[PDB]
Amino acid sequence: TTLTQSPATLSVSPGETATLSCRASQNVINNLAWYQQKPGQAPRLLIYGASTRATGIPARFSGSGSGTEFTLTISSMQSEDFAVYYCQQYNDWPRSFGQGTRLD
Amino acid sequence: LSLSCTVDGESFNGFFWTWIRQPPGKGLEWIGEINHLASTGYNPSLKSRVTISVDTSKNQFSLKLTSVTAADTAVYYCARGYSYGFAWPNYHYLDVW
């Protein structure tokens, strides 16, 4: 399955919420992962499952949605929240990532 | 035209036994088709006046065409053909004549 991220660019100043959308080709029931990659650094797992945060992840990042449509929301975007966000399904093989989104 | 076509050959089951007529100066024309069961198929143009039967015990099939006419004079062939419908390239070929 191939999944796409429609916005691909969020030019938002710090302080307000940001929303990212992920759409999958087929049904992926609550088996989606959201990763964050700092410039030049390795990606880190932010959200595993539909709406479950990884250990040590601040409660600012919230996942929602299911099936085909998923959303990731950042409430109070801080200085360190500027990174590239990636969407990966793992409901079936092979694992497929998204084209990414540049959030500045 | 009570024309029978007795054949021993290979097995009688699983084949289509057809009749084809060719009027002088024209092309071929399929006029009937019979399976080893009682099922049958006919040419719509002359279906109303043709009838083909099959006898499995004697391994033969016979065509009958009523209302004989000199306009129906032609050369008649009885042929065996096999149709394959299990995969994609479905194909039907008149095996022997």
């Binding site: 049904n27 029931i29 609550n30 299911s66 | -």
Partner: protein, 151 residues
């Protein structure tokens, strides 16, 4: 033919806010859930299996014209025990409180939070029975909970 559906998920089962009216998320532990896979005469287990099957059918499969009576007709006996509702019908006929499948009751531990397997609330004369008339059953449930706590 005994049912074979196993409940999804540590080890307990959680009823979401959609499966409950006028209530939030509820959750039952492993001990209470484990009784649903062994006993053939629990109405709550049957309804819980029905809800789990509905959720899994919605998630795994597609939707078209909502005419999914064939699916439930194929798998009606793999989720519930028809003789349970048959027995409830017999009890209703004989003028005895029966198991209307709407309301359930259970015992909560004040501090530990352990919960017994819910039992359905009996109804009679089209009105719910009041706990002064089945207090003995509640005491028996409390005694069973204490005995299980001992081991």
């Amino acid at each position: 033919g005994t049912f074979t559906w196993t409940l999804s998920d540590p080890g307990g089962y959680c009823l979401t806010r959609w499966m409950l009216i006028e209530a939030e998320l509820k959750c039952f532990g492993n001990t209470a859930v484990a009784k649903c896979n062994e006993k053939h005469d629990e109405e709550f287990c049957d309804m819980l299996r029905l809800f789990d099957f509905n959720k899994q059918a919605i998630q795994r499969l597609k939707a078209e014209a909502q005419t999914s009576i064939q699916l439930i007709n194929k798998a009606v006996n793999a989720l519930i025990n028809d003789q349970l509702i048959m027995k409830n019908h017999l009890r209703d006929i004989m003028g005895i409180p029966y198991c209307n499948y709407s309301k359930y009751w259970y015992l909560n531990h004040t501090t530990t939070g352990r919960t017994s397997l819910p039992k359905c609330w009996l109804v009679s004369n089209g009105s719910y029975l009041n706990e002064t008339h089945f207090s003995d059953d509640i005491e028996q449930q409390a005694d069973n909970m204490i005995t299980e706590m001992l081991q």
